[PDB]
Scaffold this active site. Structure first.
Site, PDB file in Angstrom:
ATOM      1  N   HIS A 368       0.676  -1.021  -0.032  1.00 28.19           N
ATOM      2  CA  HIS A 368      -0.077  -0.009  -0.049  1.00 28.19           C
ATOM      3  C   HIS A 368       0.827   1.269   0.142  1.00 28.19           C
ATOM      4  O   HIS A 368       0.128   2.383  -0.274  1.00 28.19           O
ATOM      5  CB  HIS A 368      -0.958   0.205   1.180  1.00 28.19           C
ATOM      6  CG  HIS A 368      -2.262  -0.862   1.068  1.00 28.19           C
ATOM      7  ND1 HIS A 368      -3.185  -0.496   0.431  1.00 28.19           N
ATOM      8  CD2 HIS A 368      -2.256  -2.085   1.485  1.00 28.19           C
ATOM      9  CE1 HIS A 368      -4.044  -1.588   0.561  1.00 28.19           C
ATOM     10  NE2 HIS A 368      -3.657  -2.341   0.760  1.00 28.19           N
ATOM     11  N   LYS A 559      -9.100  14.153   2.947  1.00 31.05           N
ATOM     12  CA  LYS A 559      -8.370  12.824   3.027  1.00 31.05           C
ATOM     13  C   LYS A 559      -7.635  13.004   4.409  1.00 31.05           C
ATOM     14  O   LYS A 559      -7.816  13.998   4.997  1.00 31.05           O
ATOM     15  CB  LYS A 559      -7.420  12.546   1.996  1.00 31.05           C
ATOM     16  CG  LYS A 559      -6.512  14.008   1.443  1.00 31.05           C
ATOM     17  CD  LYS A 559      -6.673  14.437   0.407  1.00 31.05           C
ATOM     18  CE  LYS A 559      -5.778  13.540  -1.002  1.00 31.05           C
ATOM     19  NZ  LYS A 559      -6.926  12.825  -1.896  1.00 31.05           N
ATOM     20  N   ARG A 560      -6.652  12.215   4.707  1.00 33.05           N
ATOM     21  CA  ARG A 560      -6.126  12.472   6.053  1.00 33.05           C
ATOM     22  C   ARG A 560      -4.967  13.578   5.784  1.00 33.05           C
ATOM     23  O   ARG A 560      -4.262  13.808   4.501  1.00 33.05           O
ATOM     24  CB  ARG A 560      -4.958  11.393   6.544  1.00 33.05           C
ATOM     25  CG  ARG A 560      -6.007  10.127   7.246  1.00 33.05           C
ATOM     26  CD  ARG A 560      -6.862  10.708   8.482  1.00 33.05           C
ATOM     27  NE  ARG A 560      -6.624   9.808   9.478  1.00 33.05           N
ATOM     28  CZ  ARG A 560      -5.574   9.765  10.198  1.00 33.05           C
ATOM     29  NH1 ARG A 560      -4.655  10.831  10.340  1.00 33.05           N
ATOM     30  NH2 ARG A 560      -5.456   8.767  11.307  1.00 33.05           N
ATOM     31  N   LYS A 565       0.243  14.643   1.048  1.00 36.74           N
ATOM     32  CA  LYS A 565      -1.014  14.662   0.443  1.00 36.74           C
ATOM     33  C   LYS A 565      -1.199  16.271  -0.113  1.00 36.74           C
ATOM     34  O   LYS A 565      -1.979  16.570  -0.849  1.00 36.74           O
ATOM     35  CB  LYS A 565      -1.922  14.483   1.411  1.00 36.74           C
ATOM     36  CG  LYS A 565      -1.949  13.075   1.945  1.00 36.74           C
ATOM     37  CD  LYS A 565      -2.961  12.154   1.392  1.00 36.74           C
ATOM     38  CE  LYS A 565      -3.454  11.014   2.089  1.00 36.74           C
ATOM     39  NZ  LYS A 565      -3.709  10.022   1.492  1.00 36.74           N
ATOM     40  N   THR A 667      -8.395   6.703  -3.407  1.00 35.34           N
ATOM     41  CA  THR A 667      -9.792   6.382  -3.699  1.00 35.34           C
ATOM     42  C   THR A 667     -10.632   7.329  -3.710  1.00 35.34           C
ATOM     43  O   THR A 667     -11.637   7.427  -4.473  1.00 35.34           O
ATOM     44  CB  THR A 667     -10.012   5.091  -2.926  1.00 35.34           C
ATOM     45  OG1 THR A 667      -9.779   5.404  -1.676  1.00 35.34           O
ATOM     46  CG2 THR A 667      -9.379   3.711  -3.445  1.00 35.34           C
ATOM     47  N   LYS A 671     -14.142   8.289  -6.131  1.00 34.27           N
ATOM     48  CA  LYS A 671     -15.375   8.663  -5.646  1.00 34.27           C
ATOM     49  C   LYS A 671     -16.079  10.073  -6.242  1.00 34.27           C
ATOM     50  O   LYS A 671     -17.135  10.187  -6.336  1.00 34.27           O
ATOM     51  CB  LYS A 671     -15.483   8.600  -4.094  1.00 34.27           C
ATOM     52  CG  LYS A 671     -14.850   7.423  -3.584  1.00 34.27           C
ATOM     53  CD  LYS A 671     -14.813   7.828  -1.922  1.00 34.27           C
ATOM     54  CE  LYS A 671     -13.835   6.584  -1.337  1.00 34.27           C
ATOM     55  NZ  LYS A 671     -13.524   7.323  -0.140  1.00 34.27           N
TER      56      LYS A 671
HETATM   57  O1  LIG Z   1      -3.352   6.221   3.681  1.00 37.19           O
HETATM   58  P1  LIG Z   1      -4.422   6.466   2.944  1.00 37.19           P
HETATM   59  O2  LIG Z   1      -4.321   7.626   1.949  1.00 37.19           O
HETATM   60  O3  LIG Z   1      -5.868   6.840   3.672  1.00 37.19           O
HETATM   61  C1  LIG Z   1      -4.767   4.831   2.218  1.00 37.19           C
HETATM   62  C2  LIG Z   1      -3.399   4.210   1.329  1.00 37.19           C
HETATM   63  O4  LIG Z   1      -4.216   2.870   0.958  1.00 37.19           O
HETATM   64  C3  LIG Z   1      -4.915   3.233  -0.052  1.00 37.19           C
HETATM   65  C4  LIG Z   1      -5.795   1.784  -0.431  1.00 37.19           C
HETATM   66  O5  LIG Z   1      -4.874   0.975  -0.979  1.00 37.19           O
HETATM   67  C5  LIG Z   1      -4.413   3.921  -1.343  1.00 37.19           C
HETATM   68  O6  LIG Z   1      -5.415   4.195  -2.313  1.00 37.19           O
HETATM   69  C6  LIG Z   1      -3.786   5.366  -0.904  1.00 37.19           C
HETATM   70  O7  LIG Z   1      -3.062   5.860  -1.980  1.00 37.19           O
HETATM   71  C7  LIG Z   1      -2.754   4.864   0.148  1.00 37.19           C
HETATM   72  O8  LIG Z   1      -1.832   5.865   0.389  1.00 37.19           O
HETATM   73  C1  LIG Z   2     -12.415   6.981   0.711  1.00 36.50           C
HETATM   74  C2  LIG Z   2     -12.066   7.755   1.766  1.00 36.50           C
HETATM   75  C3  LIG Z   2     -10.671   7.862   2.055  1.00 36.50           C
HETATM   76  C4  LIG Z   2      -9.519   7.909   1.262  1.00 36.50           C
HETATM   77  O1  LIG Z   2      -9.167   9.356   0.697  1.00 36.50           O
HETATM   78  P1  LIG Z   2      -7.804   9.343  -0.266  1.00 36.50           P
HETATM   79  O2  LIG Z   2      -7.974  10.597  -1.003  1.00 36.50           O
HETATM   80  O3  LIG Z   2      -7.825   8.094  -1.173  1.00 36.50           O
HETATM   81  O4  LIG Z   2      -6.659   9.483   0.410  1.00 36.50           O
HETATM   82  C5  LIG Z   2     -10.230   8.597   3.561  1.00 36.50           C
HETATM   83  N1  LIG Z   2     -11.401   8.676   4.382  1.00 36.50           N
HETATM   84  C6  LIG Z   2     -12.689   8.444   3.966  1.00 36.50           C
HETATM   85  C7  LIG Z   2     -13.592   8.883   5.029  1.00 36.50           C
HETATM   86  C8  LIG Z   2     -13.082   7.962   2.865  1.00 36.50           C
HETATM   87  O5  LIG Z   2     -14.414   8.120   2.474  1.00 36.50           O
END
Ligand SMILES: O=P(O)(O)C[C@H]1O[C@H](CO)[C@@H](O)[C@H](O)[C@H]1O
Ligand SMILES: *Cc1c(COP(=O)(O)O)cnc(C)c1O
Ligand SMILES: OC[C@H]1O[C@H](O[C@H]2[C@H](O)[C@@H](O)[C@@H](O[C@H]3[C@H](O)[C@@H](O)[C@@H](O[C@H]4[C@H](O)[C@@H](O)[C@@H](O[C@H]5[C@H](O)[C@@H](O)[C@@H](O)O[C@@H]5CO)O[C@@H]4CO)O[C@@H]3CO)O[C@@H]2CO)[C@H](O)[C@@H](O)[C@@H]1O
Ligand SMILES: OC[C@H]1O[C@H](O[C@H]2[C@H](O)[C@@H](O)[C@@H](O[C@H]3[C@H](O)[C@@H](O)[C@@H](O[C@H]4[C@H](O)[C@@H](O)[C@@H](O[C@H]5[C@H](O)[C@@H](O)[C@@H](O)O[C@@H]5CO)O[C@@H]4CO)O[C@@H]3CO)O[C@@H]2CO)[C@H](O)[C@@H](O)[C@@H]1O
Ligand SMILES: O=P(O)(O)C[C@H]1O[C@H](CO)[C@@H](O)[C@H](O)[C@H]1O
Ligand SMILES: O=P(O)(O)C[C@H]1O[C@H](CO)[C@@H](O)[C@H](O)[C@H]1O
Ligand SMILES: O=P(O)(O)C[C@H]1O[C@H](CO)[C@@H](O)[C@H](O)[C@H]1O
Ligand SMILES: *Cc1c(COP(=O)(O)O)cnc(C)c1O
Lengths: 833, 833
Positions: A368, A559-560, A565, A667, A671
């Protein structure tokens, strides 16, 4: 404001059946009567009536697999970000509208009750949501799949901004109960900790261990309209009664009882850390615990299969890979590999080499991230205390592995220290990503560049040794929660032209390119987004007070909050906007509401700093009268799945701004694309496959590609260069350095200035020219609304590849070796046979 | 072996209704199907179907009281020993036989399923069972009564004898769930701890307190066939989210979450101490916690009553005593008194003297013991840390109180140090029994001598100051669990001659004296006891293996293992029996099985020693071949309410052997009397009122009366005197001193020998002559069986006074001021209005 939609049928007998069963649970389950039941009590009676329509199917889906006994998919993950369950279960069962009528003719509003439900926040973000979207997809594709994890009493903390600072608070999500799980204490299992290894006569034995018990709780996971209801089994820790009490010769009876919640702390709390690594004992315990208990449930079911009868017999674990596939989500369950060797060699008595062929053929690993501080490299002294036999199994795996490497690259002595799963040094450590590649038969990335970067950088050595292992499986999102459920209006107007088969065949959305010049479709698509904007501005005015303009571009990054980011680059852009219309107050600029939301991990000081910067900016902007309402900055508090179902429909622009080569996939980006926002983003993660799907002309790409990022590193990034050459950037830094944005404490932001200037791991200045440029191109198009909606119609029409049903149909076929299916399992109906 | 009985009607529609609802819960509640549901799953489907017939009545009984709004009885107790609930709820609803037929025609056995249920062991013994029997009686007499306490996660430990030693283990009674409670988290309440008292402008304020939350769980308490279903509300502790997390400036996010189960430890475990006193902080916390939260629920309901409307208005707490009566069971809720003053003065702003008249008129206290180590005398430093305002209120109460005493006995300066609620000395302490007499309007004992001993010894000073306060209310047992439910056969043969109205009018059993010479009744009464003996010998052979002779006198002492209760005197008697038939092997002696059972508190060394002595004796006796089967000694493991429902029907002789003047009442003694055992006992506790009820000729009294006990103390007890003069006693001591009973470790019993000889607080040798004499008189009668059954028929026929319905009808009338009733509340039926 109104709706009918095709949330299924609200047919005569069933609305009637529903209301009766609603009133039944409010009385017998809830022991509440109409004159005293509050909206929460009304929520549990409906939650209880909707799970009644699910146990029939669940029980028959599980006896069904016993009878046919497919290969079984075990998805091991330490996070599962499910969000709420009532409306999702109504969608997949086609009960949305019968329960809306039922609730209407009972005088309640479904949407009020649906907002009462607490989100199950068992995940941090995207790895955990990927798990939750996979579970939906595996059930929608008729797969015998089980999601396995920990039932955390406290999930991810609830964030509160106080004085613009994040205040974290505990997510006591189980306070009012959970109507969806079914505790199964009859199935508790032991998990051993600590101990010693005796080596005698035949084999090793792990002796004098401590015993925690694993209490399972199952959640049903209903497929989309196909009567499959698979299972999420989540373990809870419980102290035993004999050792956790009896071991004697004085030490307090009350103390021995109060000390039990110390074994039960193993499932108390999710670790809240976004892409970082914490080498804490409680984490490795949580990681062994879900591995140990799950592998016992795996073997139990493999020992019935039909071999507990025959098929051959004389316990041939040979067939174990043809009956089980276990998917490791990130390295958090990598102990599944030494543990499967332990039970097979130590307890089950197979030879090392048979049990290794059986382990690599049943295990597979999903990588990941490439960011090196995320990598789990557990110190050896920890594992020898807590799991002394497993450490032993890892050393023997490593020994045997490096003997392959040295045979295949004879003499290449630095390759050997690089490929080792034992990282030598002051603190000797174990590299868990390395464990996973040695003992899995398929290793995969989450997007095409992330998959290529693994073969070429981080795991090139392993790729040269075993090219056959490496794969890619680009992420997906589920069309049911991420379209049908948060955007019923966009789904009904799509449903109107192309029908509804697209909800489990999203590639069908491409038949929407025929309507890109339809003036009725353009106007409808645009009214849905204005409606969405209008309900979210209402939500904001209501639940969080704020008041914003629905007629602006809703610019959103949620996102976080991590440096890679680049909430800071976005920040720098809105400080520029502000400065430009302060220079020229009376210039028309396309008005925009920018909304940044997300959580910082507790002790990540930069992330806590960036949330303070963003709210500090909205303190200046949202109160400047010359700005008028042309620009507003809103920090979006307590971001999580239910808020993402609210925001992403109301978005016009989606910020997917990471430094190229850091976000593995993302992801959130997908969305926003099936919900009619347009992307501004770097060629990073799946943004590359998305632009490729819609056409680069339809996407708003800017910035450094990854080659340019390595070139700048070869050269050496010097952020003073960008400061010197760009006056708008120089002006922004000085405003930060002088306390323009922090008046009563001017040096407040000097950690962030000092970093951008001298320690920018993610190059924020390098992309700033091309970023404010690209941003001038979306505003250009925004104020040509018919041409924004036609670009939007080409993004929505090309989202098919980003369904989790496509991702799962490819793991199914190329990693687990099972064929998906969509033939609905026989109708729920009765029969106790 | 068979039964039909009058466990009510098994009528056509209702057996049908039942089976359907059984199958409904097994599927929808249990998510188990017929091919996979075990006897525990079958137990919960029936538990769930029997509580369905109870919520209708519960809801209507509670709205009913809102409408009429009687004076409400709050029974505050820290223990509630409920035992199991399914069969008791079937008895009181008249469902016993419909659910027996229903279960029969579904192919299960009720009695198998009824044994699956875990006893709710929220009590130690007799104080806690008294509370449980009172609750049954208050609902059977239509009283608006609420039992209030703590919901302990762990109740009284489960005892296991290992190597003849008690091994204690945790009672995880909630492992599989509880179908009878209803969690009510919407009603959580704060309880403050620690803090400071600010004194400003108007009044005192308790400031900077810590906050634990009180989570209520209600259990229904059904009356005997009268459709009243009252409530047991039991509080659980929950940490808050803000302080139990936010208080910041570094200290671990995970640590702040794991530290929450530290506030929740307040309800983790019951204190396992029989008549002793432990001055531990966790105990006083448990004592403040149930007081604080309960008094808030009291006031809440008094503020609706109908005054939250009018009746007068301008908040007249004047009427508080005419709307509330709070009964303190022992001094464990004595903080109800300073706390009612705190809310009334501090929060509610009444003057001290109004709020004192309102406190004494609503509170009343039940004294449970005179043994001085049982008295709670909490050190002052504890209360100033934990409850600093309450300590203050206690000093002002004391000040004002002693001003009454000194006014009424002017100059009597030693009376003043005796009556003070502050016990001066090295550790200054608070005498809680003293608190209770100062602030209650009725103080009562649990039996006529115990009530007289209070007026004459322990509380003579308080009796001289306020004679009107002191009362007696002799204990009772409930005829429904303690007859109908554990002895259906004895209840049906009584039911046959005199009808069934006696189950809520036990005084009617006196119409049974007409059948004392009936040869059909004599033979039936005797067959019931032989049947009972026969099913218990089976139980023993089954669950605990042992094999005993059903044709012997079943001699049983079951209660907690304390020195004053005199398991040692009984022991000395069975060592004599043994020695006498070893002397004269071939003498006929009436064969007897002696069964001693009960729990020792963890660190009570003498009690742990006595359990070792008893099992050591059965090691010699049960293995001596010359003894044959004429004598057997069985230690009865894990004594508790469900085992007492098994043993007490099978008993022939009941040992109520305490030193006169120590057992305040006893209730075990009454249970054995309505079940046809004959008592051998000292003139102690209620044994005196029982002998008085049946006639001393029908009871087997022996031993020192209390006057003789004080005479021996005036004189000085010298146990060497009894040793010297009695050779059988001398021989027994030497056998103990030489290791006859402990071969491989001969000095093993020298703690017990040394005590009897030199430190016998309870005079075991003083009663030994008259005790083995009395014991020769029961064996004389045993072997004239028709004359034992006629003595038994005169004990059973005279048990009426020992119903809890009589005890509660007297607290009702003479302390709480409410009239009992038996008019059944309108039939359960439907209506949501
Ligand atoms: O730490 P995040 O961004 O919430 C989640 C992490 O796993 C996701 C699912 O494989 C990836 O799409 C994302 O790019 C990666 O940095
Ligand atoms: C889908 C989702 C994420 C993923 O966000 P990214 O932009 O891929 O880092 C994180 N938090 C929640 C609440 C989500 O719905
Ligand atoms: O009973 C079976 C087996 O037992 C014994 O071997 C075991 C070892 O005794 C035991 O310590 C354990 O060995 C681990 C080792 O502890 C660990 O350090 C690791 O060593 C790797 C390095 O991680 C890797 O970087 C690389 O280091 C070399 C490098 O090639 C070289 O270029 C230079 O830079 O430094 C290093 C010195 O050459 O390779 C080493 C291993 O060569 O991994 C080991 C294996 O996991 O486990 C052993 C197996 O159970 C007996 O000694 C053995 O004979 C028996 O067969
Ligand atoms: O603001 C109201 C009030 O405040 C002040 O009085 C308070 C005291 O300052 C405070 O310490 C507290 O007093 C307690 C006292 O602390 C406690 O020791 C206790 O004293 C009792 C003994 O327990 C009792 O045995 C007996 O002792 C006498 C005995 O008669 C005598 O025979 C000999 O043997 O020894 C002792 C010395 O005479 O009586 C004393 C009390 O006389 O009880 C006290 C009251 O609970 O609380 C006070 C009230 O709030 C001011 O001093 C006062 O003027 C104000 O009216
Ligand atoms: O974990 P197991 O045993 O495979 C699956 C468990 O849930 C299924 C669905 O409720 C039941 O049919 C099954 O009998 C039960 O033991
Ligand atoms: O504690 P309260 O509020 O007096 C009693 C509580 O239980 C009763 C019986 O279920 C309900 O009728 C009542 O509405 C509820 O609030
Ligand atoms: O400690 P025990 O005997 O279980 C219970 C105590 O309270 C009971 C109920 O008031 C009394 O009948 C008993 O005599 C007394 O010693
Ligand atoms: C009734 C009862 C008691 C009381 O016994 P006493 O002889 O009064 O001391 C104790 N424990 C249980 C299990 C009870 O049934």
């Amino acid at each position: 404001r109104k709706q009918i939609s095709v949330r299924g049928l609200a047919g005569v007998e069933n609305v009637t059946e529903l209301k009766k069963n609603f009133n039944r649970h409010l009385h017998f389950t809830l022991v509440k009567d109409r004159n005293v039941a509050t909206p929460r009590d009304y929520y549990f009676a409906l939650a209880h009536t909707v799970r009644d329509h699910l146990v029939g199917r669940w029980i028959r889906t599980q006896q069904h697999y016993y009878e046919k006994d497919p290969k079984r998919i075990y998805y091991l993950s330490l996070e599962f970000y499910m969000g709420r369950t009532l409306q999702n279960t109504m969608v997949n069962l086609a009960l949305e509208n019968a329960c809306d009528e039922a609730t209407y003719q009972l005088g309640l509003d479904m949407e009020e009750l649906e907002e009462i439900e607490e989100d199950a926040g068992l995940g941090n973000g995207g790895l955990g949501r990927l798990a939750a979207c996979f579970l939906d997809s595996m059930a929608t594709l008729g797969l015998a799949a089980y999601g396995y994890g920990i039932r955390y009493e406290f999930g991810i903390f609830n964030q509160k901004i106080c004085g613009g600072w994040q205040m974290e608070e505990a997510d006591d999500w189980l306070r009012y109960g959970n109507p969806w799980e079914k505790a199964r204490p009859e199935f508790t299992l032991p998990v051993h900790f600590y101990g010693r290894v005796e080596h005698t006569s035949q084999g090793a034995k792990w002796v004098d261990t401590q015993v925690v018990l694993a209490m399972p709780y199952d959640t049903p996971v209903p497929g989309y309209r196909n009567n499959v209801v698979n299972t999420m089994r989540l373990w809870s820790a419980k102290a035993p009664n004999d050792f956790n009490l009896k071991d004697f010769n004085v030490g307090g009876y009350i103390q021995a009882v109060l000390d039990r919640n110390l074994a039960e702390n193993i499932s108390r709390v999710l670790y809240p850390n976004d892409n970082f690594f914490e080498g804490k004992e409680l984490r490795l315990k949580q990681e062994y615990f879900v591995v140990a208990a799950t592998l016992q449930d795996i073997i139990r079911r493999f020992k019935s299969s039909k071999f507990g009868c025959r098929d051959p017999v004389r316990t041939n674990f040979d067939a174990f890979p043809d009956k089980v596939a276990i998917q490791l989500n990130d390295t958090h369950p990598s102990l599944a590999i030494p543990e499967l060797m332990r039970v097979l060699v130590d307890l089950e008595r197979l030879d090392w080499d048979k049990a290794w062929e059986v382990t690599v053929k049943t295990c597979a690993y999903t990588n990941h991230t490439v960011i090196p501080e995320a990598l789990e490299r557990w110190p050896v002294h920890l594992l020898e205390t807590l799991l002394p036999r497993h450490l032993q199994i890892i050393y023997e795996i490593n020994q045997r592995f490096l003997n392959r490497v040295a045979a295949a690259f004879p003499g290449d002595v630095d390759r050997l220290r690089r490929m080792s799963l034992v990282e030598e040094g002051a603190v000797k450590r174990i590299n868990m990503a390395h464990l996973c590649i040695a003992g899995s038969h398929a290793v995969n990335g989450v997007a095409r560049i992330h998959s290529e970067i693994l073969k070429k950088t981080i795991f090139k050595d392993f790729y040269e040794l075993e090219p056959h292992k490496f794969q890619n499986k680009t992420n997906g999102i589920t069309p049911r929660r991420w379209l049908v459920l948060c955007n019923p209006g966009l789904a009904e107007i799509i449903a109107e032209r192309i029908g509804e088969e697209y909800i489990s065949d999203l590639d069908q959305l491409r038949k929407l390119l025929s309507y890109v010049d339809d003036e009725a479709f353009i106007r409808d698509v645009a009214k849905v987004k204005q409606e969405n904007k209008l309900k979210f501005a209402a939500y904001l005015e209501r639940e969080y007070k704020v008041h914003i303009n629905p007629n602006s571009l809703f610019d959103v990054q949620v996102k976080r909050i991590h440096e890679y980011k680049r909430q800071l680059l976005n920040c720098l852009h809105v400080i520029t906007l502000y400065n430009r219309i302060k220079k020229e107050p009376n210039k028309f600029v396309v008005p925009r509401t920018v909304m940044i939301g997300g959580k910082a991990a507790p002790g990540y000081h930069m992330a806590k700093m960036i949330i303070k910067l963003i709210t500090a900016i909205g303190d200046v902007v949202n109160h400047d009268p010359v700005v008028g309402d042309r620009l507003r900055v809103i920090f979006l508090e307590n971001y999580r799945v239910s808020l993402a179902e609210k925001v992403i429909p109301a978005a016009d622009l989606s910020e997917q701004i990471s430094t190229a080569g850091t976000e593995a996939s993302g992801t959130g980006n997908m969305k926003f694309m099936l919900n009619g926002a347009l992307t501004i983003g770097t060629m990073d993660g799946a943004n590359v496959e998305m632009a490729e799907e819609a056409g680069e002309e339809n996407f708003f790409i800017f910035g450094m590609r990854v080659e340019d990022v390595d070139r700048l590193d070869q050269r050496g990034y010097n952020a003073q260069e960008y400061y010197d050459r760009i006056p708008e950037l120089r002006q922004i830094i000085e405003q930060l350095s002088s306390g323009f944005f922090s008046p009563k404490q001017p040096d407040l932001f000097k950690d962030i200035v000092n970093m951008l200037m001298h320690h920018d791991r993610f190059k924020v200045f390098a992309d700033y020219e091309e970023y404010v440029k690209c941003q001038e191109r979306v505003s250009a198009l925004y104020k040509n609304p018919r041409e924004w909606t036609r670009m939007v119609i080409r993004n929505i029409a090309t989202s098919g590849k980003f369904s989790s049903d496509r991702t799962i149909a490819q793991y199914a076929r190329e990693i687990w070796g099972v064929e998906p299916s969509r033939q609905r399992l026989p109708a729920p109906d009765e029969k106790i046979p």
